[PDB]
Design a protein around this ligand. Structure first.
Ligand SMILES: CC[C@@H](Nc1ncnc2[nH]ccc12)[C@H](C)O
Ligand SMILES: [Cl-]
Length: 167
């Protein structure tokens, strides 16, 4: 039993809700919140910009030190950093950005990072401003993640489309 509330159950392990991931994180304080990161951990817009803003830029400060030490992530890769005031940890995961020409096959690799954590609050990887088809992202999530994932879909209209089209 966990403290996530109001989610629709899609499979044994995948749950979904129309919600602002920032507000959800502040309410639940999950062990892991997933960020829709880029390889530079430059948290400018979309989920990343919103999460970072909610940390008063502390996420960006921590991220800049991470990059200065370790260099960029790989597309499909991840790193674990602090969750600041939002969660215990933030798993920064880089899905492919179609608006940059990146290979959509890397979306499965990106979701594999979730399997290193028993429970996560997450967005749909490569959706929104990353330019992939969200119906596809949800399918890859369900077919790749085996741990317990609570998906927050910001756009209510998109949430309804995702539910009504889910196979
Ligand atoms: C990744 C695509 C989704 N983006 C988000 N999902 C959940 N919480 C969010 N907070 C700020 C953006 C955002 C879109 C609504 O389908
Ligand atoms: Cl987005």
């Amino acid at each position: 039993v966990n403290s996530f509330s109001g989610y629709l159950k899609l499979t044994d392990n995948v749950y979904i809700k129309n919600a602002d991931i920032v507000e959800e994180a502040k309410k639940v304080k999950p062990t892991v919140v997933v960020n829709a990161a880029n390889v530079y951990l430059k948290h400018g817009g979309g989920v990343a910009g919103a999460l970072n803003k909610a940390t008063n830029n502390a996420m960006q400060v921590e991220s800049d030190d991470y990059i200065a030490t370790n260099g960029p992530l790989k597309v499909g890769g991840s790193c674990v950093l602090s969750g600041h005031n939002l969660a215990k940890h933030c798993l920064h995961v880089v899905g492919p950005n179609v608006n940059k020409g990146e290979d959509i096959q890397l979306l499965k690799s990106a979701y594999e990072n979730f399997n290193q954590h028993e429970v996560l609050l997450a967005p749909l990887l490569s959706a929104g401003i990353f330019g992939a088809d969200p119906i596809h992202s949800l399918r890859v999530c369900v077919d790749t993640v085996r741990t317990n994932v609570y998906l927050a879909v910001f756009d209510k209209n998109l949430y309804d489309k995702l539910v009504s089209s889910f196979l």
